[PDB]
Amino acid sequence: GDRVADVIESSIGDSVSRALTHALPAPTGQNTQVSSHRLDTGKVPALQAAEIGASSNASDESMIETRCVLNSHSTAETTLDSFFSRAGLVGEIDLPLKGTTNPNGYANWDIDITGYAQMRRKVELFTYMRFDAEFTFVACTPTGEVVPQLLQYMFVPPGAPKPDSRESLAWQTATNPSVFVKLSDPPAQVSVPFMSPASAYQWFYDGYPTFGEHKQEKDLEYGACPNNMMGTFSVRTVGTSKSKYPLVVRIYMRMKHVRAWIPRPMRNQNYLFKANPNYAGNSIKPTGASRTAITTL
Amino acid sequence: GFPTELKPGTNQFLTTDDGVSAPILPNFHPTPCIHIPGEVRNLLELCQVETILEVNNVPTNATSLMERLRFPVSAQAGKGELCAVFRADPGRNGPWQSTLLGQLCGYYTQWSGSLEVTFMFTGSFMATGKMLIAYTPPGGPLPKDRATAMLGTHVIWDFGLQSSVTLVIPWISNTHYRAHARDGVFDYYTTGLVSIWYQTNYVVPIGAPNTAYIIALAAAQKNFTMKLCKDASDILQTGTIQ
Amino acid sequence: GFPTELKPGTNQFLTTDDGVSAPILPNFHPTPCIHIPGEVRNLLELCQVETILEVNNVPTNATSLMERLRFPVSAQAGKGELCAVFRADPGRNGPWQSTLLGQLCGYYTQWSGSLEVTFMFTGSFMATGKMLIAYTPPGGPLPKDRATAMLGTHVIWDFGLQSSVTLVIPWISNTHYRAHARDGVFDYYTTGLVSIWYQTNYVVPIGAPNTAYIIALAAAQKNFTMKLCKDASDILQTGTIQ
Amino acid sequence: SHENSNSATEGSTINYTTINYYKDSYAATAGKQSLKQDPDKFANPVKDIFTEMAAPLK
Amino acid sequence: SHENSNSATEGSTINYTTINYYKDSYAATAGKQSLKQDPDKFANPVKDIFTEMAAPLK
Amino acid sequence: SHENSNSATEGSTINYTTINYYKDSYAATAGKQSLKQDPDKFANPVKDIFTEMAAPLK
Amino acid sequence: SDRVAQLTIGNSTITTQEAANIIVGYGEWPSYCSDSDATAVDKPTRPDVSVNRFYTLDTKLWEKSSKGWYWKFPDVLTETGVFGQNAQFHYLYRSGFCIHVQCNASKFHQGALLVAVLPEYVIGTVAGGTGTEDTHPPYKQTQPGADGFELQHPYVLDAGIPISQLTVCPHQWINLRTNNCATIIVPYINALPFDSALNHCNFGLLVVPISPLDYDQGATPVIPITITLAPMCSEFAGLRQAVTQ
Ligand SMILES: Cc1cccc(-c2ccc(OCCCCCN3CCN(c4ccncc4)C3=O)cc2)c1
Ligand code: NA
Ligand code: NA
Ligand code: NA
Ligand code: NA
């Protein structure tokens, strides 16, 4: 039991996070109300104090004489799902015949979508994201030709054995999920759930994955968060003998049922590496076009 | 089996098709979602947040990039001299590209709504002055003088305890929506021009800097909306990202 | 026929797709199901059953394999000497691989829950002693001495009629679930360390063995669960099985 | 339908209207989201709110 | 539906929720199983149960 | 159905009867239109209407 | 009446006579972790007053050529007072923060500092200038401790992102002709309920002059910028020996 006053009256333990703002319904743009001339003292909408950290509260009505306008313009297309639920390229995998890369009829791809600028820039607008996704696999030869070839795609989660060859025992796929499909068939397509151990994936992790000294040789791990590493995508031509055709697999991701937190400034320098925000120091360019003088167009 | 007949579209892969696809992990249940601050529900929420407008988008050497974030004002000769100008077109190349509004704008083909630019004076407390900021709707050429600019929508700013002032760029268009404006026939969708002039003069006493800077912050009004989702004009990658 | 349109996914064979397929034997009725003891409904039922933990996983020659099932304690010099140590990571290579919990764990990508290890003393009835068993949460390096280990979660075991004691390895993680930990960035999901020290000393009178053994049995607590089904790391076959 | 509740948005302040043929909800379509917005969370996160008519620094 | 009851789980302590288009129930999907568990059957198969607080050998 | 109202004819004096399987109404079929007609709008746009029996220039 | 203010927490009190209100990041106050959001089972320790108080950790000098600086939280405090100790002895940590950046001058000086908070502020490198070398920032740069660290290229925040858009984050400005301080309250921000105060920095505090400091010869040229901060609703769990990293 409790008895001393400071304990009885303390707020230690309040799990109810007080919120200063609440969301309101806004299916259309706000309307404009009629307004007239105002010649008042004390009243001053135009003047602000940006130092406070808040945006201007001044509206059209208070700055000029406005008419009434019934705005029925929809706000539907700017929802998270509307913006993100559009399949975009996130991975390309080659399976050549005579080659330097994967001349063995199989390949392993770490599931990381940061190798493509269009998609990457969009998701990096937010710090945390939680979503389900629809993946589509488009296969064909390097010329875009379709050939009678059977492939096997297998999802290898962290801890599961990664195939080391076209004949690896791991292809028995007794528990991992696999998709067998022909190039002649339409693109393969499946739904993937939100799989992180965290409540959300995060495109930015300012920290290290482990404890200890963080010496030069371990700096490759700064910013690496296992919670974002969902596993490997393995593919092979289904046979004990090398395929007759060179293949290319394009991977498209379409997010759905999206939630995002903490908006961030948008990338303005070319991307260089998947794992980090490194930029070319000798080519730091302005965010946009420039002109000769501030007083000329 | 049941009599069916395949129609055109069959086997096609539309990247924006909102369909149903087989689940790879049956009976899998995602990690519960705890509370995380700052959840955004609609991009329009972000468009109402003011970000810095690079009105002074002239310096280009790395060492001077930070200078683009602010432009100056200083004691003049009282002839209603011009201080600066810029197009109001938000989705057009220029000053607006530095703002989050301009960037998000790039992912949409059409937009509609009033805009606002708040100017913050960062001179010394002892500096005073009055500026005339004007918005010239389409059709009006760059005002040659303050008298001409004064004929459009404008605000007369007086420096004081309130460091900032807000210029509202009201929605004045012939069409309900504007596509991104650019030189050519698409200049049809131009929003107009914004010019800043000295109404009085930047006055300062002995002992205070003769030059101070103004920082411009821009965002959208609550009647702003965008439509027809598209890919942004920039692709931030040269070769493959490794 | 009825207007249909094929979507992507058509003709694909997803091994985990839970679909409907034509029955080969119409009107066939299976042999009735009599009562059979020991029906299991969920793998979690098995994870709560304790199996032997090979803390002493050092001997490798066939003739000594049985020695891995137990480790020793014996009269010391009373300096709070260290008896044994092992990582608590259940789905990691090491001692836990000998337990059914560890094996079943291998078929799942993520796990969550508290663990328990029960130690049974098999020395003579006349042998006595007190041991300190500690669990060091992530971040804490292998305790250099008993004083350091003592700062974490621990139990002080006293030998007596009750042959065993239970160390609970409470769920203390930053994430709701841990993936299988291993050297590298995945050490992020490590559970910690378990160290055993002499609190007093193994005391015995004249006529009784100066060395006795302890057998460790480990299982999961009732808050334990696993998710994201995957294939185990081992495939017990070399060539074709004939 | 009587399916599993494994959608990434299960328990969201904005309800969705979707389609599905499988027992796992995450297989469902994106559907329509609810149109709520909270601009102030980012544009006006001030403790003591200041009116429009008044001068921001009293 | 009005089908045959030839499923391998016909008459199980755990009921299932499945889909089927054929007259033979075993063609049906795996569906959802019921979440009952009896750990004690294996973890605590003792005749005279012993409390947690008390010492196991009285 | 409970879909979006993005059809080019949303709010027309002539109602339509259509089919659709998507959440966006413009994907729907053309269907049947209503058979209303207003010839006078073009054939007889006169202010002071003149009878048939009478002579048009009184 | 919005200019004057007093912040009292623990055994510490801050006053200011030229404020610009207070920002509460993402519109919500710090709070302790609920029983439904939690996952770790051990009973947490909540030291209260001995750790949730104001700590004045560092002072930098604003010069006509300063580029700007940043600090990482909770890194800045991991070695200070009772908070530091708790952060070292425990694996799990969580808390909010009240940040109070100070900088006064005279009615004859001028300049504007942008004070903002950026969650998961991941630092990047210049990649060898040409962008061919995959370099990485060293520990002393990602977790600079209390001395903070100076931005090499403030325009892109040393991370390839425009500072011009940093205002999308909780922030305030210190415009000398207007105010002499910034106050920002920040709730715990992470995708997990608790985390290591050593391995993970939840956010970064940026102080960057956007409008250069200026004054005439004869006016005090030494214009300090001091950083004071207070943890809020601190919680610790997963106890063992102390660890510095
Ligand atoms: C049956 C089957 C066959 C082949 C592939 C798959 C498959 C592939 C990927 C799947 O994972 C999709 C993961 C999407 C999010 C990936 N993330 C989450 C966070 N993240 C990230 C990247 C870089 N830095 C930080 C985070 C990512 O790249 C699921 C199933 C399934
Ligand atoms: Na037939
Ligand atoms: Na599918
Ligand atoms: Na027909
Ligand atoms: Na079939």
Side-chain angles (χ1 to χ4, degrees):
Chain A
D2 314 63
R3 291 292 283 75
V4 302
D6 68 279
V7 168
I8 291 171
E9 301 184 55
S10 89
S11 62
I12 293 182
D14 188 56
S15 64
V16 181
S17 51
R18 292 191 296 170
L20 302 184
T21 70
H22 57 302
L24 294 180
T28 68
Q30 205 169 66
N31 304 348
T32 296
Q33 291 296 63
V34 182
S35 74
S36 264
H37 41 276
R38 170 176 50 279
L39 303 170
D40 279 304
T41 57
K43 285 184 179 60
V44 68
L47 298 178
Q48 302 285 318
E51 294 96 329
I52 300 176
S55 300
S56 187
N57 44 53
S59 55
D60 296 39
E61 289 90 341
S62 55
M63 296 298 285
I64 61 162
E65 283 188 58
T66 59
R67 62 167 297 160
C68 168
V69 177
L70 303 180
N71 188 349
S72 43
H73 298 172
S74 178
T75 60
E77 241 186 315
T78 42
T79 60
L80 263 32
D81 262 23
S82 286
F83 182 68
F84 290 114
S85 203
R86 302 171 172 272
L89 183 67
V90 297
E92 227 170 315
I93 298 169
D94 287 293
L95 287 185
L97 294 169
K98 289 290 299 175
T100 179
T101 58
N102 309 298
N104 313 301
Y106 81 99
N108 293 316
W109 183 69
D110 259 38
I111 303 171
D112 182 335
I113 72 171
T114 60
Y116 294 90
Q118 290 205 320
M119 187 66 59
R120 181 166 175 180
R121 185 160 185 271
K122 291 177 68 180
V123 306
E124 289 194 355
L125 165 67
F126 300 101
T127 310
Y128 305 106
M129 276 185 72
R130 174 175 177 118
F131 58 79
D132 293 312
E134 180 189 69
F135 279 78
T136 309
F137 306 105
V138 178
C140 61
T141 73
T143 55
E145 202 186 314
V146 176
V147 297
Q149 181 61 47
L150 179 64
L151 299 178
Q152 164 170 17
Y153 305 130
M154 175 169 76
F155 171 47
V156 187
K162 297 184 187 181
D164 57 318
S165 83
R166 192 177 56 231
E167 295 125 300
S168 177
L169 300 172
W171 296 113
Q172 283 178 35
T173 191
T175 310
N176 294 336
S178 287
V179 175
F180 291 81
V181 64
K182 312 177 185 63
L183 264 66
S184 57
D185 295 315
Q189 195 171 63
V190 299
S191 290
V192 179
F194 176 66
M195 316 174 278
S196 173
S199 304
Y201 297 124
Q202 72 191 83
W203 307 110
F204 297 97
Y205 172 68
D206 175 37
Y208 299 88
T210 62
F211 284 97
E213 289 183 301
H214 300 291
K215 296 182 177 180
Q216 300 292 63
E217 55 286 313
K218 293 301 179 185
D219 286 339
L220 67 153
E221 58 182 46
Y222 165 66
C225 188
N227 294 163
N228 293 315
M229 305 184 194
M230 294 302 91
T232 302
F233 164 97
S234 307
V235 54
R236 71 161 178 168
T237 50
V238 188
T240 49
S241 305
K242 57 180 180 180
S243 172
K244 301 165 67 176
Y245 330 85
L247 305 172
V248 186
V249 179
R250 288 185 173 65
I251 306 169
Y252 295 86
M253 173 184 79
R254 173 183 153 244
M255 302 175 264
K256 57 181 183 172
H257 313 149
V258 184
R259 298 185 68 184
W261 300 259
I262 315 296
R264 320 165 66 77
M266 295 189 80
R267 186 79 182 184
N268 71 339
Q269 298 302 313
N270 289 311
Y271 283 117
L272 302 176
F273 310 99
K274 304 181 192 179
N276 56 66
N278 288 352
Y279 52 99
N282 298 332
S283 309
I284 300 173
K285 62 177 184 179
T287 299
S290 317
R291 53 177 163 163
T292 58
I294 213 187
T295 59
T296 289
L297 297 178
Chain B
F2 185 71
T4 59
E5 196 180 307
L6 278 24
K7 294 299 189 180
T10 287
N11 296 332
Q12 93 194 332
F13 169 38
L14 176 59
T15 60
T16 49
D17 194 14
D18 182 11
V20 170
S21 298
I24 66 172
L25 291 169
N27 303 323
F28 168 87
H29 279 268
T31 294
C33 187
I34 69 182
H35 174 68
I36 305 181
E39 178 167 13
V40 0
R41 300 179 186 63
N42 188 298
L43 297 186
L44 258 27
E45 280 165 330
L46 306 183
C47 298
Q48 292 178 55
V49 172
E50 310 180 321
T51 56
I52 307 178
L53 177 66
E54 289 180 9
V55 176
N56 178 41
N57 60 320
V58 323
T60 57
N61 48 75
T63 42
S64 293
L65 291 177
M66 288 295 286
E67 295 185 9
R68 313 183 120 221
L69 306 182
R70 78 290 184 290
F71 55 110
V73 297
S74 58
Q76 301 290 307
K79 300 296 172 58
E81 31 276 323
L82 168 72
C83 175
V85 310
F86 59 97
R87 291 224 187 58
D89 307 23
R92 179 175 196 152
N93 291 324
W96 293 81
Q97 294 172 279
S98 70
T99 69
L100 184 57
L101 170 60
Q103 287 305 319
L104 292 172
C105 219
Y107 284 101
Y108 286 86
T109 305
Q110 295 171 31
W111 64 280
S112 172
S114 306
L115 306 172
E116 65 98 353
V117 179
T118 299
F119 300 89
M120 171 172 70
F121 180 55
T122 66
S124 70
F125 169 100
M126 300 291 326
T128 78
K130 299 182 185 294
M131 306 294 275
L132 178 329
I133 307 173
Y135 163 53
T136 302
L142 191 57
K144 51 171 184 174
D145 54 49
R146 180 239 271 160
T148 296
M150 153 274 264
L151 297 174
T153 291
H154 68 285
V155 184
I156 289 178
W157 180 23
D158 188 45
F159 299 170
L161 310 182
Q162 304 308 306
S163 68
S164 325
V165 72
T166 293
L167 166 71
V168 169
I169 298 172
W171 179 249
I172 299 181
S173 173
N174 54 335
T175 53
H176 272 248
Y177 292 84
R178 289 199 222 258
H180 283 278
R182 58 177 173 287
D183 303 295
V185 306
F186 272 69
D187 220 42
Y188 168 100
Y189 300 120
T190 184
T191 296
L193 308 171
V194 178
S195 57
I196 310 179
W197 312 75
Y198 286 77
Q199 183 76 338
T200 302
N201 183 23
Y202 167 105
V203 178
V204 79
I206 303 179
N210 292 72
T211 302
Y213 299 90
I214 296 179
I215 298 177
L217 300 148
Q221 292 287 68
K222 295 188 181 303
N223 64 347
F224 183 86
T225 63
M226 306 184 282
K227 77 173 193 183
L228 216 177
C229 228
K230 73 174 185 64
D231 269 305
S233 52
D234 298 310
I235 304 185
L236 303 184
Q237 120 187 65
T238 283
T240 61
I241 297 172
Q242 41 202 300
Chain C
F2 185 71
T4 59
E5 196 180 307
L6 278 24
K7 294 299 189 180
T10 287
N11 296 332
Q12 93 194 332
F13 169 38
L14 176 59
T15 60
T16 49
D17 194 14
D18 182 11
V20 170
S21 298
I24 66 172
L25 291 169
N27 303 323
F28 168 87
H29 279 268
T31 294
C33 188
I34 69 182
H35 174 68
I36 305 181
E39 178 167 13
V40 0
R41 300 179 186 63
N42 188 298
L43 297 186
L44 258 27
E45 280 165 330
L46 306 183
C47 298
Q48 292 179 55
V49 172
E50 310 180 321
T51 56
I52 307 178
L53 177 66
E54 289 180 9
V55 176
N56 178 41
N57 60 320
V58 323
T60 57
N61 48 75
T63 42
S64 293
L65 291 177
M66 288 295 286
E67 295 184 9
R68 313 183 120 221
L69 306 182
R70 78 290 184 290
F71 55 110
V73 297
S74 58
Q76 301 290 307
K79 300 296 172 58
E81 31 276 323
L82 168 72
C83 175
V85 310
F86 59 97
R87 291 224 187 58
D89 307 23
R92 179 175 196 152
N93 291 324
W96 293 81
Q97 294 172 279
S98 70
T99 69
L100 184 57
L101 170 60
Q103 287 305 319
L104 292 172
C105 219
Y107 284 101
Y108 286 86
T109 305
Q110 295 171 31
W111 64 280
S112 172
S114 306
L115 306 172
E116 65 98 353
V117 179
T118 299
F119 300 89
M120 171 172 70
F121 180 54
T122 66
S124 70
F125 169 100
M126 300 291 326
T128 78
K130 299 182 185 294
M131 306 294 275
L132 178 328
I133 307 173
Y135 163 53
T136 302
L142 191 57
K144 51 171 184 174
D145 54 49
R146 180 239 271 160
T148 296
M150 153 274 264
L151 297 174
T153 291
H154 68 284
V155 184
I156 289 178
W157 180 23
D158 188 45
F159 299 170
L161 310 182
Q162 304 308 306
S163 68
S164 325
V165 72
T166 293
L167 166 71
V168 169
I169 298 172
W171 179 250
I172 299 181
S173 173
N174 54 335
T175 53
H176 272 248
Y177 292 84
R178 289 199 222 258
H180 283 278
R182 58 177 173 287
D183 303 295
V185 306
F186 272 69
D187 220 42
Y188 168 100
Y189 300 120
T190 184
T191 296
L193 308 171
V194 178
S195 57
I196 310 179
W197 312 75
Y198 286 77
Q199 183 76 338
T200 302
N201 183 23
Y202 167 105
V203 178
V204 79
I206 303 179
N210 292 72
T211 302
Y213 299 90
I214 296 179
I215 298 177
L217 300 148
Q221 292 287 68
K222 295 187 181 303
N223 64 347
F224 183 86
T225 63
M226 306 184 282
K227 77 173 193 183
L228 216 177
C229 228
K230 73 174 185 64
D231 269 305
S233 52
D234 298 310
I235 304 185
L236 303 184
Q237 120 187 65
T238 283
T240 61
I241 297 172
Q242 41 202 300
Chain D
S1 301
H2 188 300
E3 50 196 60
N4 293 309
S5 302
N6 26 46
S7 178
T9 55
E10 212 62 58
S12 189
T13 177
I14 58 175
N15 36 53
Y16 297 47
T17 170
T18 68
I19 291 169
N20 192 357
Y21 314 117
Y22 297 101
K23 71 183 178 303
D24 299 291
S25 64
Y26 63 83
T29 64
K32 300 171 67 177
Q33 303 191 309
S34 200
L35 278 22
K36 292 165 184 293
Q37 276 179 52
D38 181 11
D40 309 299
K41 174 183 291 197
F42 311 111
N44 195 60
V46 293
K47 172 178 175 289
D48 315 295
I49 51 183
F50 64 89
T51 323
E52 186 181 312
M53 305 273 243
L57 290 175
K58 294 173 179 174
Chain E
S1 301
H2 188 300
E3 50 196 60
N4 293 309
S5 302
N6 26 46
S7 178
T9 55
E10 212 62 58
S12 189
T13 177
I14 58 175
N15 36 53
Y16 297 47
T17 170
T18 68
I19 291 169
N20 192 357
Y21 314 117
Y22 297 101
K23 71 183 178 303
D24 299 291
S25 64
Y26 63 83
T29 64
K32 300 171 67 177
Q33 303 191 309
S34 200
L35 278 22
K36 292 166 184 293
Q37 276 179 52
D38 181 11
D40 309 299
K41 174 183 291 197
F42 311 111
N44 195 60
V46 293
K47 172 178 175 289
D48 315 295
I49 51 183
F50 64 89
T51 323
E52 186 181 312
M53 305 273 243
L57 290 175
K58 294 173 179 174
Chain F
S1 301
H2 188 300
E3 50 196 60
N4 293 309
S5 302
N6 26 46
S7 178
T9 55
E10 212 62 58
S12 189
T13 177
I14 58 175
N15 36 53
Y16 297 47
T17 170
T18 68
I19 291 169
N20 192 357
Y21 314 117
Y22 297 101
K23 71 183 178 303
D24 299 291
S25 64
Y26 63 83
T29 64
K32 300 171 67 177
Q33 303 191 309
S34 200
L35 278 22
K36 292 166 184 293
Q37 276 179 52
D38 181 11
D40 309 299
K41 174 183 291 197
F42 311 111
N44 195 60
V46 293
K47 172 178 175 289
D48 315 295
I49 51 183
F50 64 89
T51 323
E52 186 181 312
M53 305 273 243
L57 290 175
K58 294 173 179 174
Chain G
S1 181
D2 176 53
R3 310 272 301 133
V4 180
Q6 182 177 312
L7 312 172
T8 294
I9 178 166
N11 67 344
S12 64
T13 289
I14 296 182
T15 63
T16 176
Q17 299 197 56
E18 276 178 287
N21 212 316
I22 302 179
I23 286 287
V24 185
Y26 303 116
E28 55 177 276
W29 286 77
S31 68
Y32 291 88
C33 183
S34 77
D35 298 326
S36 63
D37 273 18
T39 186
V41 308
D42 65 314
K43 186 183 292 181
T45 175
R46 313 192 180 81
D48 204 45
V49 293
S50 70
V51 307
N52 302 317
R53 58 184 299 288
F54 279 118
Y55 295 107
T56 297
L57 278 54
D58 184 47
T59 303
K60 291 272 175 286
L61 297 178
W62 187 357
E63 305 185 325
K64 292 190 182 181
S65 65
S66 302
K67 287 193 287 191
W69 313 259
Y70 68 76
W71 291 261
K72 302 303 201 69
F73 290 64
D75 175 49
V76 290
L77 266 186
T78 57
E79 292 159 57
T80 305
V82 182
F83 176 88
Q85 288 314 101
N86 269 285
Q88 288 170 53
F89 275 95
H90 296 92
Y91 159 46
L92 302 177
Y93 142 86
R94 121 188 279 274
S95 94
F97 283 97
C98 176
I99 307 171
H100 189 63
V101 174
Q102 302 128 272
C103 179
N104 60 89
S106 81
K107 316 221 173 191
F108 286 80
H109 288 67
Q110 54 183 52
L113 288 173
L114 169 64
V115 180
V117 168
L118 172 60
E120 306 293 357
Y121 182 26
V122 174
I123 304 296
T125 67
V126 297
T130 55
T132 62
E133 191 184 357
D134 188 33
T135 48
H136 299 300
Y139 186 61
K140 73 166 184 288
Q141 204 189 324
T142 69
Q143 292 193 16
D147 286 300
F149 195 92
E150 173 175 287
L151 287 167
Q152 303 170 302
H153 305 91
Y155 189 75
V156 296
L157 296 170
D158 287 16
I161 49 173
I163 186 176
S164 69
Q165 296 174 26
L166 188 60
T167 55
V168 66
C169 297
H171 69 282
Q172 282 212 309
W173 295 80
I174 296 181
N175 192 9
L176 299 179
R177 63 174 279 124
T178 296
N179 55 312
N180 67 38
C181 66
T183 307
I184 304 173
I185 293 181
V186 188
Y188 186 61
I189 301 169
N190 197 353
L192 321 185
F194 284 72
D195 213 344
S196 176
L198 307 186
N199 301 333
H200 188 195
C201 286
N202 312 109
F203 67 90
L205 170 64
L206 286 135
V207 176
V208 181
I210 307 300
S211 185
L213 170 69
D214 203 358
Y215 51 91
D216 282 0
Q217 283 292 302
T220 305
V222 178
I223 308 305
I225 299 176
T226 296
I227 304 302
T228 298
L229 56 119
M232 285 195 263
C233 306
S234 295
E235 284 184 282
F236 301 97
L239 177 73
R240 28 75 168 160
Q241 68 261 49
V243 168
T244 49
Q245 65 178 296

